[PDB]
């Protein structure tokens, strides 16, 4: 292990104090009773992103329950080569500290080497009392497209209405808070901000190769790691990163 000494409210505070290496740092957001390890992605321009989700090789099963998604799972590595979910409580403590305006960057990688981005301005994750609801002001751009706005796959007219993510509470197979009369989290095997059900799903099943069929899932669920706006629902991503930085850094 190798956590760095400089600490802060987040990874940007950390970069502001001079840290120039990406790695494990301790941070203690405004309402954190205690500090905690995070992986900071620090680029040359002083930008310090607090990474809260990472997918890259299929080593961790993302079908976890409420308490597991609340507390975090997977492993943090100084080299940034492990998969993990920081925890809904920590993501909440950071994104809502001191009303600081945060931007969320979703970074995606192909099975063909191509990387795409999608930024969301004023990103926040509510408290447990409101089931860690996801809310943001507006899409700030990026080539991955805006999957969080919903998507008209074609299946129905209300598809868009039903696959948008803004305002959605979090759902795990054992804590269904979606807008579907079935259980989305349970049938797609993940923990996510489900509507009915999704156009962007980064905690889905890791499918080797990207392209996958309706058969690879007996009940025809499109449950891969998809971002409807960039790739087909039958294309599971190679790598995904969800990280946050104060809006002004954009």
């Amino acid at each position: 292990v190798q956590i760095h000494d400089i600490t802060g409210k987040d990874c940007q505070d950390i970069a502001n104090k001079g840290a120039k290496q990406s790695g494990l740092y301790f941070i203690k957001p405004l309402k954190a009773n205690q500090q905690f390890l995070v992986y900071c992605e620090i680029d040359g321009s002083g930008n310090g992103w607090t990474v809260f989700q990472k997918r890259l090789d299929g080593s961790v099963d993302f079908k976890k329950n409420w308490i597991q998604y609340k507390e975090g799972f997977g492993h943090l590595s100084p080299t940034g080569t492990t998969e993990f979910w920081l925890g809904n409580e920590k993501i909440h403590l950071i994104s809502t500290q001191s009303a600081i305006p945060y931007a969320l960057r979703v970074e995606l990688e192909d099975w063909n080497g191509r990387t795409s981005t999608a930024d969301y301005a004023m990103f926040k994750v509510g408290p447990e009392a409101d089931k860690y609801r996801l809310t943001y002001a507006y899409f700030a751009g990026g080539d991955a497209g805006d999957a969080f706005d919903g998507f008209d796959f074609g299946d129905d007219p209300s598809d868009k209405f039903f696959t948008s993510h803004n305002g959605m509470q979090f759902s795990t197979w054992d804590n269904d808070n979606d807008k579907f009369e079935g259980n989305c989290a349970e049938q797609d095997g993940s923990g996510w901000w489900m509507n009915k059900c999704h156009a962007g799903h980064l905690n889905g099943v890791y499918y080797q190769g990207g392209t996958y069929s309706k058969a690879s899932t007996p009940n025809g669920y499109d449950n891969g790691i998809i971002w409807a706006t960039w790739k087909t629902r039958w294309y599971s991503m190679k790598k995904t990163t969800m990280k946050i930085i104060p809006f002004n850094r954009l």
């Binding site: 696959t163 059900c197 999704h198």
Partner: peptide, 4 residues
């Protein structure tokens, strides 16, 4: 994706 969507649902019924």
């Amino acid at each position: 994706g969507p649902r019924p």
